[PDB]
């Protein structure tokens, strides 16, 4: 058996074909086992509608998840990604910078 704690990165991107659109992204990387729970949060509340959840693996024991959706951030709102995995004794919450 092998188990590996996910690396978690939270960031925003504008698709170049539609620059007015903005996406909030949580990239959860290099984890094992694949069992996982991942949410985007707005002001502590789970965002229910997340349009994209893309899972892949490299080696059989290394998984990668890109979890993202369109959003409209204001200066006041706080966004975060919350991840639960067997390697994390408590949920890990990573704040979006900006
Ligand atoms: Na856990």
From Swiss-Prot:
<dbReference type="GO" id="GO:0019886">
    <property type="term" value="P:antigen processing and presentation of exogenous peptide antigen via MHC class II"/>
</dbReference>
<feature type="glycosylation site" description="N-linked (Glc) (glycation) lysine; in vitro">
    <location>
        <position position="95"/>
    </location>
</feature>
<dbReference type="GO" id="GO:0042824">
    <property type="term" value="C:MHC class I peptide loading complex"/>
</dbReference>
<dbReference type="GO" id="GO:0070062">
    <property type="term" value="C:extracellular exosome"/>
</dbReference>
<dbReference type="GO" id="GO:0001916">
    <property type="term" value="P:positive regulation of T cell mediated cytotoxicity"/>
</dbReference>
<dbReference type="GO" id="GO:0002726">
    <property type="term" value="P:positive regulation of T cell cytokine production"/>
</dbReference>
<dbReference type="GO" id="GO:0012507">
    <property type="term" value="C:ER to Golgi transport vesicle membrane"/>
</dbReference>
<dbReference type="GO" id="GO:0005925">
    <property type="term" value="C:focal adhesion"/>
</dbReference>
<feature type="disulfide bond">
    <location>
        <begin position="26"/>
        <end position="81"/>
    </location>
</feature>
<keyword id="KW-1015">Disulfide bond</keyword>
<dbReference type="GO" id="GO:0051289">
    <property type="term" value="P:protein homotetramerization"/>
</dbReference>
<dbReference type="GO" id="GO:0042802">
    <property type="term" value="F:identical protein binding"/>
</dbReference>
<dbReference type="GO" id="GO:0042026">
    <property type="term" value="P:protein refolding"/>
</dbReference>
<dbReference type="GO" id="GO:0019885">
    <property type="term" value="P:antigen processing and presentation of endogenous peptide antigen via MHC class I"/>
</dbReference>
<dbReference type="GO" id="GO:0071283">
    <property type="term" value="P:cellular response to iron(III) ion"/>
</dbReference>
<dbReference type="GO" id="GO:0048260">
    <property type="term" value="P:positive regulation of receptor-mediated endocytosis"/>
</dbReference>
<dbReference type="GO" id="GO:0033077">
    <property type="term" value="P:T cell differentiation in thymus"/>
</dbReference>
<keyword id="KW-0034">Amyloid</keyword>
<keyword id="KW-0391">Immunity</keyword>
<dbReference type="GO" id="GO:0023026">
    <property type="term" value="F:MHC class II protein complex binding"/>
</dbReference>
<dbReference type="GO" id="GO:0005783">
    <property type="term" value="C:endoplasmic reticulum"/>
</dbReference>
<dbReference type="GO" id="GO:0002481">
    <property type="term" value="P:antigen processing and presentation of exogenous protein antigen via MHC class Ib, TAP-dependent"/>
</dbReference>
<dbReference type="GO" id="GO:0031901">
    <property type="term" value="C:early endosome membrane"/>
</dbReference>
<dbReference type="GO" id="GO:0050680">
    <property type="term" value="P:negative regulation of epithelial cell proliferation"/>
</dbReference>
<dbReference type="GO" id="GO:0007608">
    <property type="term" value="P:sensory perception of smell"/>
</dbReference>
<protein>
    <recommendedName>
        <fullName>Beta-2-microglobulin</fullName>
    </recommendedName>
</protein>
<dbReference type="GO" id="GO:1904724">
    <property type="term" value="C:tertiary granule lumen"/>
</dbReference>
<dbReference type="GO" id="GO:0071281">
    <property type="term" value="P:cellular response to iron ion"/>
</dbReference>
<dbReference type="GO" id="GO:0005765">
    <property type="term" value="C:lysosomal membrane"/>
</dbReference>
<dbReference type="GO" id="GO:0005886">
    <property type="term" value="C:plasma membrane"/>
</dbReference>
<dbReference type="GO" id="GO:0005829">
    <property type="term" value="C:cytosol"/>
</dbReference>
<dbReference type="GO" id="GO:0006879">
    <property type="term" value="P:intracellular iron ion homeostasis"/>
</dbReference>
<keyword id="KW-1008">Amyloidosis</keyword>
<dbReference type="GO" id="GO:0050778">
    <property type="term" value="P:positive regulation of immune response"/>
</dbReference>
<dbReference type="GO" id="GO:0005788">
    <property type="term" value="C:endoplasmic reticulum lumen"/>
</dbReference>
<feature type="glycosylation site" description="N-linked (Glc) (glycation) lysine; in vitro">
    <location>
        <position position="42"/>
    </location>
</feature>
<dbReference type="GO" id="GO:0030670">
    <property type="term" value="C:phagocytic vesicle membrane"/>
</dbReference>
<dbReference type="GO" id="GO:0016020">
    <property type="term" value="C:membrane"/>
</dbReference>
<feature type="glycosylation site" description="N-linked (Glc) (glycation) lysine; in vitro">
    <location>
        <position position="49"/>
    </location>
</feature>
<feature type="glycosylation site" description="N-linked (Glc) (glycation) isoleucine; in hemodialysis-associated amyloidosis">
    <location>
        <position position="2"/>
    </location>
</feature>
<dbReference type="GO" id="GO:1990000">
    <property type="term" value="P:amyloid fibril formation"/>
</dbReference>
<keyword id="KW-0971">Glycation</keyword>
């Amino acid at each position: 058996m092998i188990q590996r704690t996910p690396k978690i990165q939270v960031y925003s991107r504008h698709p170049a074909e539609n620059g007015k659109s903005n996406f909030l992204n949580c990239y959860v990387s290099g984890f094992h086992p694949s069992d996982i729970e991942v949410d985007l949060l707005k002001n502590g509340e789970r965002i229910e509608k997340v349009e994209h959840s893309d899972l892949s693996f490299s080696k059989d024991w290394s998984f990668y998840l890109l979890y993202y959706t369109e959003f409209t951030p204001t200066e006041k709102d706080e966004y975060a990604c919350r991840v639960n995995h067997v390697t994390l004794s408590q949920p890990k919450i990573v704040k979006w910078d900006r």
